[PDB]
Design a binder for this molecule. Structure first.
Ligand SMILES: Cc1sc2c(c1C)C(c1ccc(Cl)cc1)=N[C@@H](CC(=O)NCCCCCCCCC(=O)N[C@@H](C)C(=O)N[C@H]1CC(=O)NC1=O)c1nnc(C)n1-2
Ligand SMILES: [Zn+2]
Lengths: 376, 816, 126
C-alpha cells in the first residue's frame, strides 16, 4: 500500500497521550536574552525542525518542569564548532508536547520541541547545579524585496500579476521571466541575471531535484515561503557537520537558497566514517518515507537521539540479531541491526515489512554521525 | 571620509501629466512631473509656454487635479514614494509665482507589506474623498472637507488581496468604486460603496461578472453614458447595470495598451497607447430611445499613427496631444482630420530631450583642450541614441541609433569609439533599419570553438531573439564605420580598450557569455581581441573561457577578468596569446571590478564588497578585508586607496572604509561604513572625470560623476573635515529658513531608507540645498549666517559675514 | 568459536521439587522471557555467525535463560540460591564484557531491576 507518511512525524513510539501547548513567544531581533541550556544534547537544530526527548536525570527533569511555567523555550547550542562545549551560535527550541512518566522510583519526562530562532552566544555561565545559562542576542531575519521593485515602470504595474500557474512548463517559465524582468533594459544587467537572484526561481530550481528522490511529492507538502523552504531544505541535505553552521550563519534566504544549490551537485557516495574507503550507499537510493524529508531526528528507548536517512539499497553490511518490532520508528516494520562488515561499527538498521504487501518490502536506515559523505 | 553630492543635469524623464484649469479659471494648463521636478505650462495656439517650475523633496508617485465646490480653480493633490501627501494651490501676487500648501500629512501604516501593483490614488468625481491603495488588503479613505488640514485617514478592510485597478464611478448618489481583482478562480469585476459615517464598504450597485483573464485597465465613462470600460489584451468591454457590450479589435493584438486619456468631456472619444509606440482612438456611439435616454450602442477603435514609446498622454486643444515618455523624447503632436500619404494622422510638432535611461558613459576630450566632454548611452529599443554632453547651460547633441546601446569606450589613437549594442529580431528578420545594419563594413564571427552541442533546438514561430553588435563610430561625424555581429545566442557584457605587455598596438577586448534558454547558468564564454586599423577590423586572437565574463579591467599591462567566481588574471605574450597567471576562488560572483594601483575591488549584486591585493614576487592574490550585508547594489567605485562608494537599494548611496592602523587583525579584515544618503534616484554607472576646465581646488579631491535611470547626472567630490563641519552647519541653518513645497522635512527626504531600517544621513553634504543660498534675499542670508564663525584665527573673522559665505558657495559652484 | 553448550540431564546431580523452584519456573522465567529486552539473552552467544572470536577467551562460563529454562524443566537445580546466583552471573557477565552506557548494559540493568523486585518476594520454603 502507501504507508501514510504523516505517521513518522507524530512519534507514536513515545506514546499517544501528551499535554499540548499553543501559546507563542518570539523575542525581538537584536535583544539580549538569558536562556537555559539543555545538557547532553549534541546536535544542530534548525528553525522549524522537530527534536524528540526522553529525560531521566533529576537536573534535566526539574528544569523542563519549570520551563513549562514560564515560556517553554530553552537553547540548543550547536556544540559542533569542533567540541568542548564552546559554540558561537545556536537555535532556540520551544516545547509543544509534554508527557511525564514514572518508573522504578525514577522520574522520566518526555518532550517534543520545535526550533524557533537563531542567535549568537555572548556569555555562558554554569549556574547552581549542572544547568548552563546563556546570554544571547537574537539574530534578525532579512526579507529582501524583489530586484525590479526599484526600477519598475509605473505604467507597467498592472501587468505584474500573472494568471494562475498551470497544473508545457518550459513555455510558462519563459513567459514568467520575460514579463517579470522586463524592466531590465533600464539597467546594466541582462534579464537572465536577475533570475539567478529571484526567490521564486531559486525555490523552483531546488524543487526539480527533491521530487526526483521519491515521486509522490506535492507542492502543498512543501512551503511556499522562501524562509520556511530554505530552512526545511537545509534540514534534509546529507551534508557534513561543517556546512550546517555555514547555512545557519546566513541571514538571508536567497544566499541560503543559492548555497544549497551548490551543495546538491557534489555529494554522491556515502562511506563508512571509520574506514573512509568502504561504500554504503549513493545519492540515487535516497527517498522520503516521511513528510519531513529523507532525514529526521528520532529518539532511543534510553534517550539516544539519532538522525536517520532512509535509502532503498545499501551494501557492505551484515546482520546481527533477529527482527524486533517493538519501539519501531516506522510503524509496520521490524528492525535488525546493521554493522560495517569490515570494522563492525554501528551503521544503522534494516526494516522489513509486517503485512506481506506493503509500500516497500524492505529498506535501510542510516545514522548521520556514522557516514562520511566523500567524493567519488 | 566626507563627500559632497550635487546634480549637474536635472532629471529628464516624465512619469505623469495632467491638464486642467490650475493657474486661473480661464487658461488651459499642462502639468508635468519629472521625478522630483514639477513644471507648469500654459497651452497656446503656437505651443507650450512655461510659467513655473518647482522641486519636491521626494519622488512624485500620485498627481491629480480636482476642484471642490466653492473654489475658483483646480487644486493639486500629490503623494510621494515615502507616503507623504499634500494639497497645493497656485497663488499669483504681483509678478511672484508661489505654490501655496493648504493641508499636508504623512499617510503610512506602521506595519504592512507594500502592494505588488504599486501606489494607486483616485479622487471622487464629486470631490468627497480620496481613495488610496498602498498595502494589500486595505483601502484608505480621506474626508475632503476644509477642516481636514492634517490629512487624517482611515482603513477599510478588503476580502480580495489582488486588486489590479480601481476607479471611482460617475453619476452615483453615494461614492462608488469599481475594481478588477484576481482569485484562484480568475479575474472578476466587482463594485462597492463607501460610507463616510459607517467607514465600511456597503453592497455594490451592480453585480459581479467574469472578465477576461488579462483585464488590467478600468475607465470611468462620464455622466451621459455612465458605467465603466474594461480593457484587457484581446477585448474591450463596457459594463453598466445589466447592459454589457464587448468588442474584439484585431489591431490591438500585437501590443499591450497601458495608458489612456479622455478627448471629449462627454466621453465620446478616448486615446490609447501601447508598448511599442502606437496611438489609438476609441470612439463611443450614442443612441436616443425616444424616452430622453442616452445609451451606448457600439464601440470601435482606430489606428491614429505612431509616436514615441509613451508613458502618459494628454489631449490639449485642436488636435494637439502631449506624449510623455520615459525611454525616449517627449513630443507635441497634431491630429489631422485627413491622413497623410503614409496614412498617419499624426504630425510631429516639437521634441523635448531626455537622457534617460543612462546605462553607460565615458569622459573624453575631443579637442585636446582643457574642458572635457561626456558621452552617454541613452534610451532603449527604437529610442536608443548617443548623447554628447558639453559644458558650453549644458549643450546636448543627439546621435540616433535605433538600437539599444550598452557599452562605450574611446580609443585616442584610432580616433574612434567602441559601442556594444543590441537589436531585437523576430524569427531571422530585422524589424527596422538599425545603426548596425547601415554600416560600411561588416564582419560576422566564425564559430570554431562553439559547436553548439548544448542547444534546445526549439526554434518556435515568431519568437524574439536578440542580436548583439560592436560598432565603430567616428568621433567627428559620429557615423558608423564598422559593425561586428556576435554569434547566435551570444551576449556581450564587458568591453575594454587597452594595450598589454610590450606591444605598441592598442586593442579592443570583449567578453561574452553563451547563454541558452534551458540552463540557468552559463557554462561557456569567450574573450576576443580586436584591432581596428585603416578602416578595417580584425580578430587577432580569442580565448574560450568556461563561464561568463562579467567584468574586465586592465591591471598594469595584464588583463584582469572575472569569470563567475574566479578572478583569473591574464598575460599578453610575444606570440599574441593570453596566458593564465593567478586565480582567486570566491563564494560570490564578481560582477563589479575596480582597480587602483595594486588593489582590486570585487563585488556582487547582493552588496558583498571584497578587497584583494596583488603579491608580485609570489605571483598570487591575497584578501585584505571584506564586508557582507545582504541588500541590492547597483554599482561601486574607488574613491581613494581606503574608501569605496556604491549605490544600494531604495535609491541610496553608501561609502565604506578601510582601517590600516587597526589594533588587532579582527578589525584589519573589516570595512566600516562611514556614509549613508538617500539620493533619490537609481545610479547605474560611475566615472572619474570633470566637465569644467582642467586646472591652473581646496574643496575638491577627485570629481567622480554618475548617471541615473531618470537621466540625471551628478557629481561627488571628497572634502576636508573643517569644510564638512561648515557645510553641515549650513544645511541645518538653511532648513529653518527654506519653506519647502508640501512642508516636507529635509531630514526625512535624505534619510537612508529601506524596507527594514531608516537612519539619518551621515558623511554626505547635499550641494543642491547649499546652492539655493544665492537665490534667497539678503535678509535671509543674514539670518542664515547670523551667529556663525568661519576663519583661521583672529576671532574666527569675528562674526562670520554673509559675503564670505556667498563667496565660498560661489567657489563651490565653480566645480560644475 | 562458540564452545559446546552447557550440559543438560546430568544423572549424577541430586534433585527434589520445591515451591521455590516451581516459582522460579512458572512465574519468574516466563516473566523475564516476555520482555522487550529479553531477546538477546535467550541462547548461547553464537560467536561464529556473530564473528566475535575473542568472546570465549574472556567468558569461560557462558550462561543464558534458555539454558536455565532447560535446567528447570529437567529439574537440574537443588535450591533457589543456586538460581539467584546464576541470574546474577548473567547480569555480571554483561557488565564485565561490555562498557557503561552501552545499549546491552542498559537492557541488562532494566531486567535486573525487575528481577530484584521479584526476588524480594521469594516464598518461604515449605
Ligand atoms: C545473537 C546475539 S548474542 C549477542 C548479540 C546478538 C545479536 C549482540 C547484541 C548487540 C546489541 C543488541 Cl541491541 C542485541 C544483541 N551483540 C553481541 C556482541 C556484539 O556483537 N557487540 C557489538 C554490537 C554492535 C552493534 C550495536 C548496535 C546497538 C544500537 C541499536 O541498534 N540500538 C537499538 C535499541 C535502536 O536504537 N533501535 C532503534 C530502531 C528503531 O526502529 N527504534 C529504535 O529505537 C553480544 N554480546 N552479548 C550478547 C548476548 N550478544
Ligand atoms: Zn567500517
Amino acid at each position: 500500500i502507501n504507508f501514510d507518511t504523516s505517521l513518522p512525524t507524530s512519534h507514536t513510539y513515545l506514546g499517544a497521550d501528551m499535554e499540548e501547548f499553543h501559546g507563542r513567544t518570539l523575542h525581538d531581533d537584536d535583544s539580549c536574552q538569558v536562556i537555559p541550556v539543555l545538557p547532553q544534547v549534541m546536535m544542530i537544530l534548525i528553525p522549524g525542525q522537530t527534536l524528540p526527548l526522553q529525560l531521566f536525570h533529576p537536573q534535566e527533569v526539574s528544569m523542563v518542569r519549570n520551563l513549562i511555567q514560564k515560556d517553554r523555550t530553552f537553547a540548543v547550542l550547536a556544540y559542533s564548532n569542533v567540541q568542548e562545549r564552546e559554540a558561537q551560535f545556536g537555535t532556540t527550541a520551544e516545547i509543544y508536547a509534554y508527557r511525564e512518566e514514572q518508573d522504578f522510583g525514577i522520574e522520566i519526562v518526555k518532550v517534543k520541541a520545535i526550533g524557533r530562532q537563531r542567535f549568537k552566544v555572548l556569555e555562558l555561565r554554569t549556574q547552581s547545579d549542572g544547568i548552563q545559562q546563556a546570554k544571547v542576542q537574537i539574530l534578525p531575519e532579512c526579507v529582501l524585496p524583489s530586484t525590479m521593485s526599484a526600477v519598475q515602470l509605473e505604467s507597467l504595474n498592472k501587468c505584474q500579476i500573472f494568471p494562475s500557474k498551470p497544473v508545457c512548463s518550459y513555455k510558462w517559465w519563459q513567459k514568467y521571466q520575460k514579463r517579470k524582468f522586463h524592466c531590465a533594459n533600464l539597467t546594466s544587467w541582462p534579464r537572465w541575471l536577475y533570475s539567478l537572484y529571484d526567490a521564486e526561481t531559486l525555490m523552483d530550481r531546488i524543487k526539480k531535484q527533491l521530487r526526483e528522490w521519491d515521486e509522490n511529492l506535492k507542492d502543498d507538502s512543501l512551503p511556499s515561503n522562501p524562509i520556511d523552504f530554505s530552512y526545511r531544505v537545509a534540514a534534509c541535505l546529507p551534508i557534513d557537520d561543517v556546512l550546517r553552521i555555514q547555512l545557519l550563519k546566513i541571514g538571508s534566504a536567497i544566499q541560503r537558497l543559492r548555497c544549497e544549490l551548490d551543495i546538491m551537485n557534489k555529494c554522491t557516495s556515502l562511506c563508512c566514517k571509520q574506514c573512509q574507503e568502504t561504500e554504503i550507499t549513493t545519492k540515487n537510493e535516497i527517498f522520503s518515507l516521511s513528510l519531513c524529508g529523507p532525514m529526521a531526528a528520532y529518539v532511543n528507548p534510553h534517550g539516544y537521539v539519532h538522525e536517520t536517512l532512509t535509502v532503498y539499497k545499501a551494501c557492505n553490511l551484515n546482520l546481527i540479531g533477529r527482527p524486533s518490532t517493538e519501539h519501531s520508528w516506522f510503524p509496520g516494520y521490524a528492525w535488525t541491526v546493521a554493522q560495517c562488515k569490515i570494522c563492525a561499527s554501528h551503521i544503522g538498521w534494516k526494516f522489513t515489512a509486517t503485512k506481506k504487501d506493503m509500500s516497500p518490502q524492505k529498506f535501510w536506515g542510516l545514522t548521520r554521525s556514522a557516514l562520511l559523505p566523500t567524493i567519488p | 571620509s566626507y563627500n559632497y553630492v550635487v546634480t549637474a543635469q536635472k532629471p529628464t524623464a516624465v512619469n505623469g501629466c495632467v491638464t486642467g484649469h490650475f493657474t486661473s479659471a480661464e487658461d488651459l494648463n499642462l502639468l508635468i512631473a519629472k521625478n522630483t521636478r514639477l513644471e507648469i505650462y500654459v497651452v497656446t495656439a503656437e505651443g507650450l509656454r512655461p510659467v513655473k517650475e518647482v522641486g519636491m523633496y521626494g519622488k512624485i508617485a500620485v498627481m491629480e487635479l480636482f476642484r471642490p465646490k466653492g473654489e475658483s480653480k483646480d487644486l493639486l493633490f500629490i503623494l510621494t514614494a515615502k507616503y507623504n501627501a499634500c494639497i497645493l494651490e497656485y497663488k499669483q501676487s504681483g509678478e511672484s509665482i508661489d505654490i501655496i500648501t493648504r493641508a499636508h500629512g504623512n499617510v503610512q501604516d506602521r506595519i504592512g507589506r507594500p502592494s505588488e501593483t504599486g501606489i494607486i490614488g483616485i479622487i471622487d468625481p464629486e470631490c468627497r474623498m480620496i481613495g488610496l491603495r498602498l498595502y494589500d488588503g486595505l483601502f484608505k479613505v480621506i474626508p475632503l472637507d476644509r477642516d481636514n488640514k492634517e490629512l487624517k485617514a482611515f482603513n477599510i478592510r478588503l476580502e480580495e488581496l489582488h486588486v489590479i485597478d480601481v476607479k471611482f464611478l460617475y453619476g452615483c448618489q453615494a461614492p462608488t468604486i469599481c475594481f478588477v481583482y484576481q482569485d484562484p478562480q480568475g479575474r472578476h469585476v466587482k463594485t462597492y460603496e463607501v460610507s463616510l459615517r459607517e467607514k465600511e464598504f456597503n453592497k455594490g450597485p451592480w453585480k459581479q461578472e467574469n472578465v477576461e483573464a488579462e483585464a488590467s485597465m478600468v475607465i470611468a465613462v462620464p455622466e451621459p453614458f455612465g458605467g465603466a470600460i474594461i480593457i484587457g489584451q484581446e477585448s474591450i468591454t463596457y459594463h453598466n447595470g445589466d447592459k454589457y457590450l464587448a468588442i474584439a479589435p484585431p489591431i490591438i493584438k500585437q501590443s499591450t495598451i497601458v495608458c489612456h486619456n479622455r478627448v471629449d468631456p462627454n466621453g465620446s472619444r478616448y486615446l490609447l497607447g501601447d508598448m511599442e509606440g502606437r496611438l489609438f482612438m476609441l470612439l463611443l456611439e450614442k443612441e436616443e430611445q425616444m424616452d430622453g435616454t442616452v445609451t451606448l450602442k457600439d464601440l470601435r477603435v482606430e489606428l491614429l499613427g505612431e509616436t514615441s514609446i509613451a508613458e502618459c498622454l494628454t489631449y490639449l486643444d485642436n488636435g494637439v496631444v502631449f506624449v510623455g515618455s520615459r525611454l525616449g523624447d517627449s513630443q507635441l503632436v497634431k491630429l489631422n482630420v485627413d491622413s497623410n500619404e503614409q496614412g498617419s494622422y499624426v504630425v510631429a510638432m516639437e521634441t523635448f530631450t531626455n537622457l534617460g535611461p543612462i546605462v553607460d558613459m565615458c569622459v573624453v576630450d575631443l579637442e585636446r583642450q582643457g574642458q572635457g566632454q561626456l558621452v552617454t548611452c541613452s534610451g532603449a529599443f527604437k529610442e536608443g541614441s548617443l548623447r554628447i554632453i558639453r559644458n558650453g547651460k549644458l549643450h546636448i547633441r543627439t546621435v540616433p541609433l535605433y538600437e539599444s546601446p550598452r557599452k562605450i569606450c574611446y580609443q585616442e589613437v584610432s580616433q574612434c569609439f567602441g559601442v556594444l549594442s543590441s537589436r531585437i529580431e523576430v524569427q531571422t528578420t530585422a524589424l527596422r533599419p538599425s545603426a548596425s545594419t547601415q554600416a560600411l563594413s561588416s564582419s560576422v564571427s566564425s564559430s570554431k570553438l562553439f559547436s553548439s552541442s548544448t542547444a534546445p533546438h526549439e526554434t518556435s514561430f515568431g519568437e524574439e531573439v536578440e542580436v548583439h553588435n560592436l560598432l565603430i563610430i567616428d568621433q567627428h561625424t559620429f557615423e558608423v564605420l564598422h559593425a561586428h555581429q556576435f554569434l547566435q545566442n551570444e551576449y556581450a557584457l564587458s568591453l575594454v580598450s587597452c594595450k598589454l605587455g610590450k606591444d605598441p598596438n592598442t586593442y579592443f577586448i570583449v567578453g561574452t557569455a553563451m547563454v541558452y534558454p534551458e540552463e540557468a547558468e552559463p557554462k561557456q564564454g569567450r574573450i576576443v581581441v580586436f584591432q581596428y586599423s585603416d578602416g578595417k577590423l580584425q580578430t587577432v586572437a580569442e580565448k574560450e573561457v568556461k563561464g561568463a565574463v562579467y567584468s574586465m579591467v586592465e591591471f598594469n599591462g595584464k588583463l584582469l577578468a572575472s569569470i563567475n567566481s574566479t578572478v583569473r588574471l591574464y598575460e599578453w605574450t610575444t606570440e599574441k596569446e593570453l596566458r593564465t597567471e593567478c586565480n582567486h576562488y570566491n563564494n560570490i560572483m564578481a560582477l563589479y571590478l575596480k582597480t587602483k594601483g595594486d588593489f582590486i575591488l570585487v563585488g556582487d549584486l547582493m552588496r558583498s564588497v571584497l578587497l584583494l591585493a596583488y603579491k608580485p614576487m609570489e605571483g598570487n592574490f591575497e584578501e585584505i578585508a571584506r564586508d557582507f550585508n545582504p541588500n541590492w547594489m547597483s554599482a561601486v567605485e574607488i574613491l581613494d586607496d581606503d574608501n569605496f562608494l556604491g549605490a544600494e537599494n531604495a535609491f541610496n548611496l553608501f561609502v565604506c572604509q578601510k582601517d590600516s592602523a587597526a589594533t588587532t587583525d579582527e578589525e584589519r579584515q573589516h570595512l566600516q561604513e562611514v556614509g549613508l544618503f538617500h539620493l533619490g534616484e537609481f545610479v547605474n554607472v560611475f566615472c572619474h572625470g570633470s566637465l569644467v576646465m582642467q586646472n591652473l581646488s581646496t574643496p575638491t579631491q577627485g570629481s567622480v560623476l554618475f548617471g541615473t535611470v531618470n537621466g540625471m547626472i551628478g557629481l561627488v567630490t571628497s572634502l576636508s573635515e573643517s569644510w564638512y563641519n561648515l557645510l553641515l552647519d549650513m544645511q541645518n541653518r538653511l532648513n529653518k529658513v527654506i519653506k519647502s513645497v508640501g512642508k516636507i522635512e529635509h531630514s526625512f527626504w535624505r534619510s537612508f531608507h529601506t524596507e527594514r531600517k531608516t537612519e539619518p544621513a551621515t558623511g554626505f553634504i547635499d550641494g543642491d540645498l547649499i546652492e539655493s543660498f544665492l537665490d534667497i534675499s539678503r535678509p535671509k542670508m543674514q539670518e542664515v549666517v547670523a551667529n556663525l564663525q568661519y576663519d583661521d584665527g583672529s576671532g574666527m573673522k569675528r562674526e562670520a559675514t554673509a559675503d564670505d559665505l556667498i563667496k565660498v558657495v560661489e567657489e563651490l559652484t565653480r566645480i560644475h | 568459536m562458540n564452545p559446546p553448550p552447557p550440559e543438560t540431564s546430568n544423572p549424577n546431580k541430586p534433585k527434589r521439587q520445591t515451591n521455590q523452584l516451581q516459582y522460579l519456573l512458572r512465574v519468574v522465567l516466563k516473566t523475564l522471557w516476555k520482555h522487550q529486552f529479553a531477546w538477546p539473552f535467550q541462547q548461547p552467544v553464537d560467536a561464529v555467525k556473530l564473528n566475535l572470536p575473542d568472546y570465549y577467551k574472556i567468558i569461560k562460563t557462558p550462561m543464558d535463560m534458555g539454558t536455565i529454562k532447560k535446567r528447570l524443566e529437567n529439574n537440574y537445580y537443588w535450591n533457589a540460591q543456586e538460581c539467584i546466583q546464576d541470574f546474577n552471573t548473567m547480569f555480571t557477565n554483561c557488565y564485565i564484557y561490555n562498557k557503561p552506557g552501552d545499549d546491552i548494559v542498559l537492557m541488562a540493568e532494566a531486567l535486573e531491576k525487575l528481577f530484584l523486585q521479584k526476588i524480594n518476594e521469594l516464598p518461604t520454603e515449605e
